[PDB]
């Protein structure tokens, strides 16, 4: 038996019609790993700035930055 | 509208338009003002129409100012048909007296915040001294409520219970400003009038006025505020 | 505080009305 | 206020017109009766 | 009063509601 | 203006103040 | 431009890459 | 699936679990009432 | 049948009723936001933004409304102490009412989605089975989130189309909702720089749009699909719970340490501003200046703002409260109604003494008066026998400058002791305790309560993420092992 | 006057139409519904 | 406090007790 | 007042204990 057909459901149907469709092999996993390591480096940068383990020129890292 | 064309319209075509609350406007004439024959005149058909109500208010940060309100009542704030006499001298000195008429209008405005400010926009018994371009004076501001006015619990000055009777053991010594006395002591207000337009063929004078007066005290209760009324005024001479 | 209680009681009554209308036990022709 | 009055006049006219032409739309035929 | 009336109203709502919900849920589980 | 005086005046009230904790290798 | 803290941070990133390569080589050395 | 919802499941609570829940609630009340009343 | 802790599993394989319970949850959360706003408006006192700000009154969501621009009320008052003559629709009560209406609409939508669960949209067109294309749905959601983040950063907080965000001076005296220019340099990663917020939101929104387009286009690989179980909604739940407690840890740390997004005028001072002598240092620097310029001590302490003096007070420390000390700080130590002025202590010899301030750890602290060179010169002894440093023995007088006691000098030890004990807590204020029946014990700030709630939620959500990752990876053995 | 108002009260105003745009929107809405009903008749 | 703690304790007792009693009575009627 | 609450909570806990002992669901050996 079929489901309930609605105009909006028909409009949105192609966006939920490709479940289980995958690429063979590893796909873009290497690019994803590169993005993940870059994001880890970025998070480490901001953590070390806000920990004052990384000191930069114009980054006061205090309430005086509100000035 | 000029007074002539106002009298040229009938009550049926004025009714509902709001023109009955509007002062006449001297469309003809000149603004020299000092080109007026000095002497003793019978002030007649004195009329006053506000154009703004502002209320003196104090915010949290320490700033006092006259804030704008919303007029709660309808077009019932006009004063018209007042009588009196005024004296004009050759130097420009003027004395101004209003005898009687529709010289009071109960008005209510709403402050930003929802507070109701009732007041009696009045100009009665106004003594004004000054020059033709400006004369300042004082007027009597009566009590908003008459002495026979009753509160929602029936208490009042010249009539009522004089105590909260719904409480058989609570009417004493703490609600003294609520029940022990209902004070109806009158107040005073200040006004400054300024003649702008004049026509000496008919003797009509007009101009603007600025008044500061106390609001209602709620029969010896929560203190009154200062109401600043700017507006127009009109009248005929002799 | 009391206005909160009054409004809560009124809207709870209206919610009971809504549920009794739209989620009633359907009468069965059997 | 005039914008509000125009909108309310449009709304009331719309619903009244729906009412009028709905009962004009062969309404005595809309019954399960025979004949 | 402000708070004793509050707890009285809360109890008068919740305890009979609990009783009715107990009976209804057992009945509806029994269809 | 006298940073030494304001330092020696914040110090007895609070020894953990950042003015006391900063650049005190010179002291 | 580059503070000593920034230079040490970049060198620490290089050292982390080096030690990850070293543990990968230790894995493949079996 | 169909007109009825196929994911219907019946919740169960035996008497031992009722006793455990009642004990948990009352023991939490005993423990925290001194702090709530302060 | 089901255990009570598994009931909500009935919507794992029902996308329509999953949408329905999500909609009900959203309705409940929006309704809470509206109702909490109305409660805080009903109990909020706006008549003194200096000595009774919102963070002294237990206001929790009022700072979050004020942070993004809602600063006026329908009661005619502005949060900055000014007069609001036209608050508009988006007042505090307007946002509350909008959230209540949103809650009702979401309740209706939840009812509709509960009833009409069997939508062919949720059926896979190939096999006819119910399924969700979770990578595609994530792409759509990431694209929408990037669009919303970019719009919020480029139009709201910049003041291009929205009102901006709350920005203050470093000492919390002249804060207001202002438009904020983005900071595209390294200073944009300054946490206390307000310009970092628009730049982050613009850049992260652009990246979210690009990554959402990528996830709309590119299908996952089979290896990563099977590794992360992208066909199971519980895998998405585990990763979402992980991201959510990561964000909870981030916001808890940001609120506790302070940032540009957690102003002290809205959330109260931080404990580190008391620990590191932030306001004390600023006050003493402002007193040292204009003393070199040539003013006496009675003035240039009257020049000190009472707001700054109130900031330099340990009763406003967020780390001086308790787990069961409930409510507003006003209910703890009274409503502050006046600064008494700076208290200067002197001995018989004429040298100036300073009260050792109470550290954050200590519930109680001994009263100790120390000279300029770090030598203890007076105290309130515990042992009033064979003592050498009592106020009576040393002859300590106290003089107040700048407040309600300006110019007054007290020499009697019974009053010098109480003023030294009050100076232990920082700047000395007078407190009205009869209004709220304050118990004389310090409460916690809204930033402290926020940090506590979110750190607790972050740990509990770490456990939830562990549990759901376990459930996803070990689904086939959830009811037991294979026995072979 | 201190404020603006329509001042349409009383005065025996036809359908309360103080501005001809009101009569026009009444006529337009009624005629649009009539036109839909008319081009949609003989369809039952 | 004396009465807000009272209503907190009463609600924390009754509402989970109501939930548990609903589930138990439903179960015991089922079996 | 608070002493009443404490005593009631303790007595209710003891009542739950009494019921859990003597009105337990019996272990069935089948
Ligand atoms: C993230 C959650 C969060 C945060 C951080 C705040 C923070 C705040 N709220 Mg708030 N609020 C919340 C959500 C939150 N609320 C929600 C969900 C509601 C709806 C129920 C409320 C309703 C609410 C009211 C109505 C009021 C507050 C007030 C307060 C302020 C006073 C301190 C406080 O919380 O009381 C102290 C907090 C505690 C003592 C926490 C209890 C610790 C845990 C929960 C106990 C462990 C559970 C235990 C087993 C329970 C058994 C007890 C039982 C025996 C009775 C503070 C700024 C007060 C205020 O100042 O208003 C302006 C106030 O009156 N809020
Ligand atoms: C033009 C570039 C630009 C600008 C100027 C900013 C500026 C900002 N970003 Mg950034 N960002 C950008 C683009 C930009 N971003 C883009 C393109 C991305 C990718 C979409 C992001 C993604 C991003 C992330 C994900 C984060 C920011 C954050 C920030 C803030 C850094 C300062 C701060 O408060 O950190 C304070 C925050 C940190 C230092 C994060 C530390 C997190 C640690 C490493 C882990 C914490 C949890 C961990 C599990 C610990 C558990 C508990 C422990 C006890 C065990 C600041 C507003 C942070 C933020 O919003 O702060 C509130 C943040 O979390 N940004
Ligand atoms: C039109 C919809 C709308 C609007 C614009 C508002 C507006 C407001 N709400 Mg909200 N709200 C709404 C819908 C809305 N809400 C709904 C749908 C709910 C139910 C969920 C609520 C529930 C809610 C609560 C619970 C609260 C408000 C509050 C607020 C106020 C401040 C918001 C704030 O501090 O943001 C802060 C918001 C954030 C910091 C969210 C940031 C988004 C995170 C970081 C996303 C992380 C994951 C993401 C996918 C990563 C993207 C990746 C990237 C590469 C793109 C403001 C008046 C607050 C208030 O003061 O109420 C009185 C508050 O307490 N609202
Ligand atoms: C948003 C995150 C989220 C969501 C969507 C779920 C969803 C799920 N969890 Mg849960 N989980 C999470 C967070 C989440 N969890 C966290 C944070 C914890 C750690 C504390 C866990 C630990 C966990 C366990 C250990 C179990 C699940 C299970 C379940 C499933 C059934 C839940 C149920 O019927 O409860 C029914 C709950 C009740 C009938 C009453 C709970 C009342 C609580 C105790 C107090 C009241 C909560 C209060 C009203 C809400 C305010 C708090 C809020 C701000 C978080 C469901 C798939 C079960 C599962 O996998 O089933 C197979 C399972 O055994 N969860
Ligand atoms: C005790 C910690 C712990 C444990 C054992 C789990 C367990 C689980 N995680 Mg994980 N996770 C954790 C915490 C944890 N996580 C935290 C803190 C985050 C960040 C929010 C996540 C984010 C995360 C996501 C988003 C997902 C899981 C998933 C999973 C499951 C698959 C295993 C996996 O991918 O491991 C995750 C791998 C690790 C935790 C190892 C991290 C090692 C890092 C790279 C070391 C970096 C150190 C570096 C030098 C930085 C130093 C910082 C310093 C300077 C401060 C499993 C159930 C995945 C899954 O399939 O669930 C079904 C999934 O989707 N995890
Ligand atoms: C019973 C179920 C509720 C338990 C809580 C009882 C609170 C007792 C009480 O009366 O408080 C009541 C107090 C308020 O209490 C009153 O407040 C008044 C001002 O509004 C005055 O200040 C009064 O002096 C004060 O007593 O606060 C609350 O209403 C509780 C708010 C609920 C949210 C608390 C913060 C959330 C923190 C963490 C979230 C959970 C994190 C995971 C777990 C950890
Ligand atoms: C039962 C009900 C029927 C029983 C008795 C009915 C009694 C009298 C019926 C005739 C009354 C007078 C007819 C003219 C009314 C009129 O012109 O209104 C015109 C008035 C005037 O409108 C006002 O006029 C004022 C000045 O007089 C101001 O200008 C105001 O701004 C303006 O709004 O507007 C209305 O009262 C609204 C009428 C809308 C009616 C809609 C409902 C009808 C429903 C079904 C009808 C189906 C067909
Ligand atoms: C099926 C039937 C469907 C629809 C009705 C069919 C035809 C209706 C056609 C009406 C076309 C003119 C309407 C507009 C109009 O008359 O407004 C014009 C006037 C509005 O009234 C006048 O408007 C003037 C400006 O044009 C002035 O400003 C004043 O408002 C007033 O004097 O309408 C009327 O006077 C009476 C309208 C009702 C008859
Ligand atoms: C918005 C307001 C929301 C209201 C809250 C509603 C939820 C309140 C109730 C939730 C919890 C109910 C718990 C039931 C408890 C219960 O259901 O029974 C035990 C329960 C039963 O597991 P089973 O799968 O065998 O149960 C099958 C079914 O009969 C149960 O559904 O096991 C659990 O995993 C639950 C927790 C572990 C049990 C131990 C916890 C209790 C120990 C207490 C120790 C006290 C002694 C201290 C001495 C120092
Ligand atoms: C304030 C302004 C509004 C004034 C109110 C009074 C206006 C006069 C209305 C008198 C109508 C007399 C009844 C005719 C039959 C009604 C039933 C019918 O219809 O029975 C239907 C019948 C079946 O054939 O039709 C027919 O016999 C032909 C009937 C003719 C229908 C009259 C339409 C005139 C023009 C309508 C507006 C121009 C409309 C265009 C608008 C399109 C979008 C801009
Ligand atoms: C229907 C409808 C409507 C109405 C609506 C409404 C009226 C709504 C609302 C609502 C509301 C009014 C809501 C509220 C809510 C709340 C909530 C949801 C909450 C909560 C809670 C919690 C969850 C908590 C918990 C806790 C405690 C108890 C204490 C401490 C701890 C904790 C925090 C855990 C309208 C007309 C609009 C539209 C149409 C439809």
């Amino acid at each position: 038996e079929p489901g309930i057909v609605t105009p909006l459901g028909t409009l949105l149907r192609p966006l939920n019609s490709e479940a289980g469709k995958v690429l063979p092999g590893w796909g873009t996993t290497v690019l994803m790993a590169v993005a993940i390591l870059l994001f880890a480096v970025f998070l480490l940068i901001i953590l070390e700035i806000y920990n004052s383990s990384l000191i930069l020129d114009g980054v006061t890292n205090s309430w005086e930055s509100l000035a | 509208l000029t007074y002539d064309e106002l009298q040229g319209l009938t009550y049926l075509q004025v009714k509902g338009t709001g023109i009955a609350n509007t002062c006449p406007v001297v469309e003809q004439g000149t603004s020299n003002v000092r080109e007026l024959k000095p002497g003793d005149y019978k002030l007649e058909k004195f009329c006053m129409e506000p154009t703004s109500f502002t209320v003196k208010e104090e915010d949290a940060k320490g700033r006092e100012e006259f804030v704008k309100t919303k007029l709660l009542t309808r077009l019932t704030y006009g004063l018209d048909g007042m009588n009196g006499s005024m004296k004009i001298n050759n130097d420009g000195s003027v004395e101004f007296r209003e005898d009687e008429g529709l010289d009071y209008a109960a008005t209510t405005v709403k402050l930003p915040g929802g507070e109701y400010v009732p007041f009696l926009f009045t100009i009665k018994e106004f003594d004004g001294k000054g020059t033709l371009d400006s004369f300042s004076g004082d007027f009597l501001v009566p009590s908003y409520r008459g002495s026979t006015f009753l509160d929602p619990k029936g208490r009042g000055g010249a009539t009522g219970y004089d105590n909260a009777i719904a409480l058989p053991a609570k009417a004493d010594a703490d609600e003294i400003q609520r029940l022990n006395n209902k004070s109806y002591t009158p107040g005073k207000g200040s006004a400054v009038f300024s003649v702008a337009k004049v026509d000496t063929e008919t003797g009509e004078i007009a101009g603007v006025f600025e008044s500061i007066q106390p609001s209602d005290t709620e029969m010896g209760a929560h203190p009154a505020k200062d109401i600043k009324i700017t507006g127009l005024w009109y009248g005929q001479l002799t | 505080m009391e206005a909160l209680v009054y409004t809560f009681l009124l809207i709870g009554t209206l919610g009971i009305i809504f549920f009794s209308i739209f989620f009633r036990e359907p009468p069965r022709i059997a | 206020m005039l914008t509000l009055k125009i909108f309310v006049y449009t709304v009331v006219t719309f619903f009244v017109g729906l009412f009028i032409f709905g009962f004009l739309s062969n309404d005595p035929s809309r019954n399960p009766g025979k004949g | 009063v402000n708070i004793l009336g509050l707890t009285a109203t809360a109890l008068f709502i919740i305890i009979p509601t609990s009783f009715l919900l107990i009976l209804y849920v057992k009945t509806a589980a029994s269809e | 203006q006298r940073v030494r005086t304001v330092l020696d005046m914040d110090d007895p009230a609070k020894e953990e103040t950042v003015k006391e904790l900063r650049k005190d290798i010179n002291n | 431009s580059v503070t000593p803290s920034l230079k040490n941070f970049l060198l620490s990133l290089v050292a982390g890459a080096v030690v990850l390569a070293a543990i990968a080589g230790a894995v493949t050395a079996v | 699936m169909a007109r009825p919802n196929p994911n219907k499941q019946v919740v169960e609570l035996n008497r031992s679990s009722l006793y455990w829940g009642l004990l948990l609630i009352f023991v939490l009340a005993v423990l925290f009432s001194s702090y709530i009343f302060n | 049948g089901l255990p009570w802790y598994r009931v909500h599993t009935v919507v794992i394989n029902d996308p329509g009723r999953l949408i329905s319970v999500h909609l009900m949850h959203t309705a409940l959360v929006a309704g809470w936001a509206g109702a909490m706003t109305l409660f805080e408006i009903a109990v909020f006192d706006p008549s003194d933004p200096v000595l009774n700000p919102m963070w002294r009154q237990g206001m929790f969501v009022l700072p979050f409304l004020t942070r993004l621009g809602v600063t006026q009320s329908w009661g005619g008052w502005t949060i900055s102490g000014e007069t609001s003559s036209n608050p508009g629709i988006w007042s505090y009560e307007g946002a509350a009412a909008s959230h209540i209406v949103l809650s009702g609409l979401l309740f209706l939508a939840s009812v509709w989605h509960w009833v009409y669960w069997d939508l062919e949209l949720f059926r896979d067109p190939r096999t006819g089975k119910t399924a969700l294309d979770l990578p595609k749905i994530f792409g759509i959601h990431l694209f929408l989130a990037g669009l919303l983040c970019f719009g919020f950063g480029a139009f709201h907080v910049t003041g291009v189309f929205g009102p901006g965000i709350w920005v203050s001076d470093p000492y919390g005296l002249t804060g207001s909702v202002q438009p904020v220019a983005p900071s595209w340099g390294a200073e944009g990663f300054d946490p206390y720089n307000p310009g970092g917020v628009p730049a982050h939101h613009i850049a992260a929104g652009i990246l979210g749009v690009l990554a959402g387009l990528f996830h709309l286009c590119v299908r996952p690989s089979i290896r990563l699909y099977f590794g992360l179980s992208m066909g199971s909604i519980e895998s998405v739940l585990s990763s979402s719970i992980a991201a959510v407690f990561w964000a909870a840890f981030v916001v808890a740390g940001t609120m506790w340490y302070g940032s540009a997004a957690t102003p002290i005028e809205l959330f109260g001072p931080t404990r580190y501003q008391w620990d590191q002598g932030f306001f004390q240092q600023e006050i003493q620097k402002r007193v040292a200046q204009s003393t070199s310029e040539g003013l006496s001590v009675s003035e240039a302490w009257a020049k000190i703002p009472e707001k700054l003096a109130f900031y330099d007070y340990i009763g406003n420390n967020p780390a001086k409260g308790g787990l069961f000390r409930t409510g507003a700080m006003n209910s703890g130590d009274g409503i502050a109604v006046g600064w008494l002025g700076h208290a200067s202590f002197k001995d018989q010899e004429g040298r100036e003494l300073f009260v050792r301030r109470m550290p954050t750890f200590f519930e109680t602290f001994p009263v100790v008066l120390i000279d300029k060179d770090g030598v203890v010169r007076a105290d309130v002894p515990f042992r009033k026998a064979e003592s050498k440093y009592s106020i009576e023995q040393v002859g300590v007088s106290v003089t107040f400058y700048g407040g309600e006691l300006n110019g007054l000098t007290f020499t009697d030890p019974s009053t010098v002791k109480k003023y030294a004990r009050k100076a232990q807590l920082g700047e000395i204020f007078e407190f009205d305790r009869s209004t709220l029946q304050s118990d004389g014990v310090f409460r916690s700030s809204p930033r402290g309560w926020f940090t506590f709630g979110h750190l607790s939620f972050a740990l509990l959500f770490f456990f939830g993420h562990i549990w759901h990752g376990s459930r996803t990876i070990f689904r086939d053995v959830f009811a037991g092992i294979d026995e072979d | 006057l201190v404020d603006d108002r329509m001042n349409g009260d009383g005065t025996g105003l036809p359908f309360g139409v103080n501005d001809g745009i009101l009569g026009w929107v009444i006529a337009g809405t009624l005629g649009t519904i009539w036109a839909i009903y008319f081009v949609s008749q003989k369809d039952l």
Side-chain angles (χ1 to χ4, degrees), chain B residues 59-62, chain I residues 46 49 78-83:
Chain B
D59 60 355
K61 73 182 177 180
Chain I
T78 317
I79 203 67
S80 47
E82 316 168 29
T83 299

Side-chain angles (χ1 to χ4, degrees), chain I residues 54-122:
Chain I
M54 65 175 94
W55 52 267
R56 289 281 306 188
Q57 315 191 34
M59 300 308 152
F60 181 49
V61 296
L62 190 66
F64 288 91
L65 293 148
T66 316
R67 180 172 75 173
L68 294 187
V70 179
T71 57
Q72 301 171 52
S73 170
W74 284 343
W77 53 265
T78 317
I79 203 67
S80 47
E82 316 168 29
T83 299
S84 55
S85 297
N86 184 41
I89 294 92
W90 299 122
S91 70
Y92 294 116
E93 305 89 343
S98 69
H99 282 88
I100 299 301
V101 174
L102 181 65
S103 173
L105 294 175
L106 294 163
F107 166 83
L108 291 186
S110 174
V111 170
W112 190 92
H113 269 289
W114 188 265
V115 177
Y116 295 99
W117 57 273
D118 199 2
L119 300 181
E120 56 89 21
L121 166 66
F122 307 129

